[PDB]
């Protein structure tokens, strides 16, 4: 029995492990999305950079969750990482929609975990998630939504031209 | 059919994809090894740092392989990542032995791939692997072997004392 | 008989002379491509600069080959330089396709020479080509393929507008 | 018909194209002269450097002519480049004599072109040639003549010693 | 049995030990050549410095080979060092010829070792030799050949004068 | 007969040549001792560095002796270098004892040579040895004796632990 563990439920410990898996898998998805936009027959460098930076941020989220698990006296447990949902990611709007779907699923897991900690009366967990995760998610999702609106407006006009202009002038 | 692909076999393309998977899985193993040494009941910060730095280096290897795949006109394909072989990693000597086993398996995949490129008369592949991978592996494995010899010499004497001294004065 | 020559075949010496000719002729082609984009009725300065820089790089390749020929004790022999294949180079996509064709032909001569040195057991030649030529070619061809994909996407939409935008925002 | 072309004869346009060819071929000759003095059995580094620098200057002359052709609304047209007149260039005095012969032939083509522009009442051409070409030629030829006199004086005495001393102390 | 050794043949291990001996003996030869040119009745300081610097470079080669032997898990084994082939080294041309003979013998041992590693499918060895040894040898031998040609040209004229001039103005 | 030689006996000249051989052989011994401590199964980096630095110092001693031989008008003569007395050097205390034995043998050769110069009334030799060799030896031997006492005290307690601590905290 842990020499430091206090007010830390087995349910929260398990939930944090699942969330690590979800962050790792999102990182993997972004690695894939990034290298797809690096293909010579896709060739949108700004889009590649966008998603590769997101891969690093998700990996950072997982590491932060793992650090907290140990701080609280929980034990990190890792599961297999399922490969990303697609091998090819279509056009800029397809990939940005996919990204928002992924982020919304992360945000919901965060929200579920926050509801669990609140039901378990775990204020440290609730402060940890609010400080480092919940606002970062809101801000990123807003940014993605802004990007989708701009991409959609551009590719309604002329699809190839619009995609090029967005990568050049926004990304 | 790729506008840039030249002298790049389907066998090498497939082999490079498998090697990416192997590097990603090694990264995952090192993340696990690192956070285990971060546990309040293990508490060897130098050892944690050692393995967490290795996680970053393996992730860097995977990214470099993916970049080359695209440079050559191959298509990156990702598979599921199997979880690390253990959930708990025992003592410093156990973990360092595990690390050498893992690295030796990476080095053999690199050697196999180099033999394949040589049989396919792919000099770019052979130069790529020699420049960025084969010497890094030799140097890392030597470093690990040096570490194991020092840890074994220390924990033969007095196991807890020896483990502490190694983490403090070498790592 | 040369006071320094060792392990350097007459076949490799001849092949290196042919490759110098091929590099010189590529330089000439790029000079032509560059000044065509400088015409008042073509007027794409970024495209001119792209090809004029490539003319300098190919001339650098020839000089490096000549320096090695002398280092090894071979004798540089020069042949007539055939003029470039066209007098006028059409549109940006036409010129970029022509460039990829030229580079792919250079890369194949490099690959052939590397196979010859390997059959002659000439490791210095094989290291020389890998270090200074084979990776530069792979990277340049990837860059060109990226450019073609972007130009094609732009000129599918609206050809003049697309060509202008590419020269302004990528080149 | 060119939107910018004014007072620019078809005869001058053709003459400028021939002169580009002559400058390119002189550059080629100097590349050859330079790498000959780089041979392990010739080994006069100052002489190599002399001629390799001249190769760059002649290439610069060709580029300047091509730029002016486009400025005036003429169309650059390239022809085959004949290889240099020799494969081996003998002694320092032989090579310096060859250089003066080549430069005198360039200067005469410049003089002929200036006489053509003057007969065509093309003052821009006449100013262009005077500013960038005619005085550079006079100064270079004087320099070469100075060098020949010094080399001849030295190799009259003792030929190998004299050649070494000139390369060391003048070049 | 070595905890790190992988893909490293007993034949290569033995060959590397022989090459260390060959590098050490070359260092010894250059020490001798250097101090001979330091004699009050020889007195060519530039020549002394030339060979003493080469003694240091050969010692560096031996150390680099020994470091790699240990990196790979081989065991360094040292043999007696035979004294240099001469006690007195004649004139500058005699000593430079002797140096080229020695270097050509080193280069052939390197080439033989590279052929052995290639037959043993040891790509690390092959990359190690190419990176640090084979090009250094080619460049040094070219330099020596250049020096011999210059010395021979000078001492054909007037032997003492020529030897002095070479030491003063080249070395 | 030497234009500079004065008060320099054939006996001293011969003795200085023998001492050069002894210094060279000590250098060789230290190279061996150094690379043994570099082995992955020995792995004491401080000890390696200690002996490799001593190899350089002994090589410096030999060079200084050779320089003086020439200053005095003597002729350097080199003999075969016998390999070091062991291929493997045991533990830190074994190697430090071996080092003291070697240094004591060098110091005795220096003392013998000083007694010879004094019997030959060669004050320059006697001052040369006192200034650059005799005090360096006394200081090095004291340092080694200090090291042995510390190593012996440590490995009396717990041998592996003690050896590690000495390499970490003294070397």
Swiss-Prot record, chains A, B, C, D, E, F:
Biological process terms from the Gene Ontology for this record are: intracellular iron ion homeostasis; iron ion transport
Question: Where are the N-acetylserine residues found in this chain?
Answer: 1
In the record, what terms sit under GO molecular function?
ferric iron binding; ferrous iron binding; iron ion binding
Where is it mostly found? cytoplasm
Q: Which UniProt keywords apply?
A: Acetylation, Cytoplasm, Cytoplasmic vesicle, Iron, Iron storage, Lysosome, Metal-binding
Question: Which residues does the UniProt record annotate as the domain Ferritin-like diiron?
Answer: 6-155
Cite the InterPro entries for this sequence. Ferritin, Ferritin-like, Ferritin-like_diiron, Ferritin-like_SF, Ferritin_CS, Ferritin_DPS_dom
UniProt entry tagged with the keyword Phosphoprotein: no
Q: How does it assemble?
A: Oligomer of 24 subunits. There are two types of subunits: L (light) chain and H (heavy) chain. The major chain can be light or heavy, depending on the species and tissue type. The functional molecule forms a roughly spherical shell with a diameter of 12 nm and contains a central cavity into which the insoluble mineral iron core is deposited. Interacts with NCOA4.
Which positions are annotated as binding Fe cation?
A: 53, 56-57, 60, 63
Q: Which family does it belong to?
A: Belongs to the ferritin family.
Q: Output the Gene3D superfamilies linked to this UniProt entry.
A: 1.20.1260.10
Cell location: Cytoplasmic vesicle, Autophagosome; Cytoplasm; Autolysosome
Name of the molecule in the record? Ferritin light chain
Q: What does this protein do?
A: Stores iron in a soluble, non-toxic, readily available form. Important for iron homeostasis. Iron is taken up in the ferrous form and deposited as ferric hydroxides after oxidation. Also plays a role in delivery of iron to cells. Mediates iron uptake in capsule cells of the developing kidney. Delivery to lysosomes by the cargo receptor NCOA4 for autophagic degradation and release or iron.
What organism does the record attribute this protein to? Answer: Equus caballus (Horse)
**Note, other:** In horse spleen the light chain is the major chain.
**GO CC list:** autolysosome; autophagosome; cytoplasm; cytoplasmic vesicle; ferritin complex
The gene designation is FTL
Region feature Catalytic site for iron oxidation, mapped onto this chain? 53-60
Q: Which domain of life is it from?
A: Eukaryota
